Amino acid sequence: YNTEAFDEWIRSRFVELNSQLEQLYYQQTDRANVQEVGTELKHTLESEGRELVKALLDEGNTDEGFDSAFDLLGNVGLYMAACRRHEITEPTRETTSPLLEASALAMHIGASIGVTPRFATAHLTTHNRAHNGIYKRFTDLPDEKLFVDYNTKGILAYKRASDALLKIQPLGISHPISHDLLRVTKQALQDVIESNQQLFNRLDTDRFFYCVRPYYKPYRVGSVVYRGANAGDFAGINVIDLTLGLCFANEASYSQMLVDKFLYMMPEDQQILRECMRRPNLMDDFLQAKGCIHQDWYQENLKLFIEVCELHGQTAIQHHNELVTKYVLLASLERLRDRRAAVLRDDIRTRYYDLKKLKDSLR
Amino acid sequence: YNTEAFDEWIRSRFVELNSQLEQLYYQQTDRANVQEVGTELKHTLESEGRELVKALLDEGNTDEGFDSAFDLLGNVGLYMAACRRHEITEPTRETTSPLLEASALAMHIGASIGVTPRFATAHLTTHNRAHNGIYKRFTDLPDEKLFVDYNTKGILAYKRASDALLKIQPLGISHPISHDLLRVTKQALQDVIESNQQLFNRLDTDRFFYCVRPYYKPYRVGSVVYRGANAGDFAGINVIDLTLGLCFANEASYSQMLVDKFLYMMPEDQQILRECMRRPNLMDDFLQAKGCIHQDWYQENLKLFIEVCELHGQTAIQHHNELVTKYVLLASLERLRDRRAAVLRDDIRTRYYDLKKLKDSLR
Numbered sequence: 001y002n003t004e005a006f007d008e009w010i011r012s013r014f015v016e017l018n019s020q021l022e023q024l025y026y027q028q029t030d031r032a033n034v035q036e037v038g039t040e041l042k043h044t045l046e047s048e049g050r051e052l053v054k055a056l057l058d059e060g061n062t063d064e065g066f067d068s069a070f071d072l073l074g075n076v077g078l079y080m081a082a083c084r085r086h087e088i089t090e091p092t093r094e095t096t097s098p099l100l101e102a103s104a105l106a107m108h109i110g111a112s113i114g115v116t117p118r119f120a121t122a123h124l125t126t127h128n129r130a131h132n133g134i135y136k137r138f139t140d141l142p143d144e145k146l147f148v149d150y151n152t153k154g155i156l157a158y159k160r161a162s163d164a165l166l167k168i169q170p171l172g173i174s175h176p177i178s179h180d181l182l183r184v185t186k187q188a189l190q191d192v193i194e195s196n197q198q199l200f201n202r203l204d205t206d207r208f209f210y211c212v213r214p215y216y217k218p219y220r221v222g223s224v225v226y227r228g229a230n231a232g233d234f235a236g237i238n239v240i241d242l243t244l245g246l247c248f249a250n251e252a253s254y255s256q257m258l259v260d261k262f263l264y265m266m267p268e269d270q271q272i273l274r275e276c277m278r279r280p281n282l283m284d285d286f287l288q289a290k291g292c293i294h295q296d297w298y299q300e301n302l303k304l305f306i307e308v309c310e311l312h313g314q315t316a317i318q319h320h321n322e323l324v325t326k327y328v329l330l331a332s333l334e335r336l337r338d339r340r341a342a343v344l345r346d347d348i349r350t351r352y353y354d355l356k357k358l359k360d361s362l363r
Numbered sequence: 364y365n366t367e368a369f370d371e372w373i374r375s376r377f378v379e380l381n382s383q384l385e386q387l388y389y390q391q392t393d394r395a396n397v398q399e400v401g402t403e404l405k406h407t408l409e410s411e412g413r414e415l416v417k418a419l420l421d422e423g424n425t426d427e428g429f430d431s432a433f434d435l436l437g438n439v440g441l442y443m444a445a446c447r448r449h450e451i452t453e454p455t456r457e458t459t460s461p462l463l464e465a466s467a468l469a470m471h472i473g474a475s476i477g478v479t480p481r482f483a484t485a486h487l488t489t490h491n492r493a494h495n496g497i498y499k500r501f502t503d504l505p506d507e508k509l510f511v512d513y514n515t516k517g518i519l520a521y522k523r524a525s526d527a528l529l530k531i532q533p534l535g536i537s538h539p540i541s542h543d544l545l546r547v548t549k550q551a552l553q554d555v556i557e558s559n560q561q562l563f564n565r566l567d568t569d570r571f572f573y574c575v576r577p578y579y580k581p582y583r584v585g586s587v588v589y590r591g592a593n594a595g596d597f598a599g600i601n602v603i604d605l606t607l608g609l610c611f612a613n614e615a616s617y618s619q620m621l622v623d624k625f626l627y628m629m630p631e632d633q634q635i636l637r638e639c640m641r642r643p644n645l646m647d648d649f650l651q652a653k654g655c656i657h658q659d660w661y662q663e664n665l666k667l668f669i670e671v672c673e674l675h676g677q678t679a680i681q682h683h684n685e686l687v688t689k690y691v692l693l694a695s696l697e698r699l700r701d702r703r704a705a706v707l708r709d710d711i712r713t714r715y716y717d718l719k720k721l722k723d724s725l726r
Contacts, residue, residue: 067533126530130538133660152540156530160547163526167489167519170430175493177515184523297496 003072006052006167010075012138014074017045034087041148042086046099046342047182049079053101058103063214066113066267070127073109074136076102077119077267081228083140084219097220106221111259114270116263117221121233125152127266137214143207150199151231154192158236161188165282166272173285173305174297188309200322209327231323233261235269244309245283246351247339249276257336257354283309283351286358291362306359309351313341364423366435369415373438375498380408381445382502384575394573399448401596409462412442416464423468429476429630433490435583436472437499439465440482444591445501447582460583469584477633480584488515490629497666502612503577506570513562514594517555521599524551528606528645529635531635536668537660539679545667552674559678572690594686596624598632605639607672608646609714610702612639616695616711639651646714648723656724669722674713675705 023040025031053076060072079336083089089098097103102115110117114324128135137144164177164184171178216228232238238258241247247254258277262270282305292298320337323332337347342351378381384389386396387401416439423435443465446452452461460466466480473480486493488511491498527547534541580592595601601621604610610617621640625633645668655661687693698711705714 127533128538129533130535130541130660132655133539133658134538135535135538149539153543156540156543159530160523160526165524167522170490170492171498174494175491175498176496176512177519178493180516180519184519249391292495295496297493 006056006058006075009052011208015137017041017138021086022139026210029185035298042088044089046083053105055186056102057105069109069113073106074123076106077123080199080219084217085214089219091218091220092226094220096220103222105204109360114267116226119229120264121229122266124148125155141211143204146199146203147208147212154195155234157188157191157195161185162236162239165240173282173301179301179304182301182308185308186311192315196318210215213327229264233264235265235273237277238273243281245281247343287354290361299362300360302362306319309342309355316340365418367610368706369419370436372415373441378427378500378503382402384449385502389573393655405451409446409451413464415712416468420464420468432476436469437486440486443582444482447580448577452582454581454583454588456627457583459586466585477630481589482592483627484592487511488518492541501673507568507575509562509566510571513558517558518597520551520554520558524548525599525602536645536664542549542664545664545671547649548671549674552671557680559681576690596627598628598636601638603675604703606644609642609705615658650717662725665721666725673717679703
């Protein structure tokens with residue numbers, strides 16, 4: 001009953017509170033400011049949530065399967081995420097989370113099922129259950145809905161793309177069916193392009209920067225600081241990077257990057273991702289077959305392969321100049337985006353010269 | 364070296380032999396007859412294969428990973444499958460397989476990795492590696508190529524369909540993203556329709572019945588008889604049946620059917636399939652939400668759901684009247700087809716009226 005009670009709260013009262021609070025913040029001239037404004041609604045949010053959590057730290061260890069645990073972790077994470085937004089909790093300001101009940105329960109479940117002890121992308125996107133059309137959310141703001149909905153669509157599209165690329169491994173780059181898989185990959189990547197363009201042309205730049213993004217901030221769970229969930233927190237996009245050979249696992253900078261996000265994705269994705277790190281990539285296969293340049297399968301599949309790559313880089317630059325350039329680690333972000341777009345660089349390694357070498361093979 | 368030697372043989376000499384033999388059979392007036400015709404080529408096929416196998420029953424236990432094992436099982440199975448075709452081995456005629464070396468190795472690997480000890484659909488379709496455009500095959504006949512290629516395409520399409528259906532489970536039938544998944548499922552099912560139509564309009568009914576089908580016959584591995592691989596020997600098509608609710612695992616006739624094909628698919632598929640048996644289905648979800656008939660998500664998603672179902676039944680009738688009606692257990696084969704198409708049945712239980720109830724719900 002308690003678990004169900006906490007979920008109902010998250011899907012009702014929880015939304016009203018954050019919404020009413022966003023209305024207050026959006027009024028002031030600062031708008032980003034939180035210091036002194038809705039100190040009354042904040043107490044109600046923290047207090048109500050905390051009691052529901054405490055009433056849960058009793059039957060929140062019975063183990064009702066992975067899905068139930070992850071879902072419960074979501075609600076607790078969602079609650080803690082809001083608290084961080086309303087600065088009811090702050091990382092640097094503190095030495096350890098002031099939310100004792102919620103922290104202990106979060107860390108208990110996360111370590112139990114192998115995921116970070118906080119709100120992760122899957123909680124609001126791919127694994128956010130809807131009850132009569134209504135699913136989990138922080139506020140009732142139309143812009144939050146546009147962000148979540150299109151992120152979910154983009155994420156699912158990236159999964160359709162990675163799934164097709166993986167099915168090539170047992171066939172080989174010269175198999176005729178690989179052409180079809182390559183085409184399926186292209187369509188999925190185009191859906192990502194379309195999906196993002198839609199988001200960029202319907203999202204309110206101001207409503208998102210002041211009423212949506214602040215919920216995706218880093219916060220402490222126990223004494224450790226856990227950064228906020230990202231749109232790339234899933235296997236899909238990374239599987240594509242490795243399989244296409246646009247990224248290299250043999251480099252410290254990249255492997256460390258993957259290590260810092262494994263816990264932020266589903267256990268299934270973590271395993272699929274890990275495996276990609278120790279498998280051959282399509283780029284290097286086409287390069288080792290430079291001599292078969294005159295073969296029909298070579299020019300037919302290579303052509304498609306190249307389009308897939310330039311298509312993936314395309315979505316890398318757009319995403320960057322939209323959710324990054326507008327709203328320290330920015331260099332690493334540019335690095336990743338340059339690797340995906342196989343852009344010409346000299347400070348780091350890029351598939352630019354290799355990709356160019358192949359394109360010229362087809363003349 | 365031995366493993367590589369056997370594979371090279373399967374990809375070269377093996378093909379020439381079966382091909383030359385098909386030429387002899389196709390000449391005679393009987394055409395299906397094998398008794399007295401190419402007794403010389405048969406010995407060469409059996410003898411050469413057997414020696415390569417014996418030279419393998421030494422380093423065929425080193426365990427080089429699942430992929431290598433399954434691939435090796437494929438070659439041995441392919442060899443034994445051809446022997447059954449050329450009646451060098453016959454089930455009822457024998458009490459135990461006359462191919463001692465190949466049987467012991469086949470049963471050793473299959474039991475080792477959890478799959479049937481013979482040629483399975485995946486060996487020629489989804490997991491048939493191509494070397495410079497050329498992949499495993501029995502003969503060099505253009506019609507065999509049409510059968511394999513289109514089966515593979517159809518199989519991959521079914522997997523894209525099942526993947527999308529599964530991703531609905533955590534979202535719910537009322538989630539807006541579920542509409543997109545339902546649409547993705549529809550497109551994949553249409554590719555199956557198109558893919559099959561293509562095969563039915565390009566395949567030589569005679570060349571297939573006399574030169575292709577006979578390689579998919581049942582044969583003994585040890586003392587047990589193992590039926591031939593089917594196009595439905597994968598998770599995909601079955602996942603759809605259960606998730607859409609068109610079939611019922613709570614019935615002996617169906618569960619037994621699944622039990623008889625688990626070993627014929629990849630371990631990954633077996634697990635995914637098994638899980639579907641103990642999960643809710645979309646059909647029953649839409650029925651339990653009969654009251655939400657006026658909801659926007661209800662009429663938008665139900666409409667698509669219904670199309671997906673009628674689309675799946677459509678591919679069930681076509682496949683049946685093409686690869687079955689043309690070329691005892693026919694009852695069961697027909698029962699399954701009636702389940703998938705949800706046709707009116709008084710004998711067995713079908714989703715005909717439930718589906719009718721849902722359509723009328725949309726007025």
